[PDB]
Amino acid sequence: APAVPDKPVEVKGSQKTVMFPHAPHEKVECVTCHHLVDGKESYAKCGSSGCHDDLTAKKGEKSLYYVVHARGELKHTSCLACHSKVVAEKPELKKDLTGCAKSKCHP
């Protein structure tokens, strides 16, 4: 593949909306975020019926949370994960690329 999204996409969850810009993640491979599905190309919602549908549960491969605030070991690369490694160089953006309160994610 589809065309790289231009207008920020909303990541509706429980009762909050966290906008996500693709530009910033234009260099980062799509395979990095958009992991293959059963060894097949996909581009459905991160929380599509069957997948990370659960937005409440914390742990679980079906939790939209476990695929965001999961710095531990996983099958793919998490956001907070990369970010952590990213800020690794710029610990001054940790309040943006990891910050819980007043972050590029949580406003």
Please report, in range form, the residues annotated as the binding site for heme c: 14-16, 22, 25, 30, 33-35, 46, 51-52, 69, 75-76, 79, 82-83, 90, 100, 105-106
| Per-residue b or e along 24-59, where b marks 16 or more CB atoms closer than 10 Å to that residue's CB | ebeeeeeeebeeeeeeeeeeeebbeeebbebbeeee
Nearer to ligand HEC by C-beta: 28 or 91?
Answer: 28
Annotated binding site for heme b: 14-16, 22, 25, 30, 33-35, 45-46, 51-52, 69, 75-76, 79, 82-83, 100, 105-106
Nearer to ligand HEC by C-beta: 61 or 91?
Answer: 61
Residue 78 near residue 88 (C-beta atoms within 8 A) = no
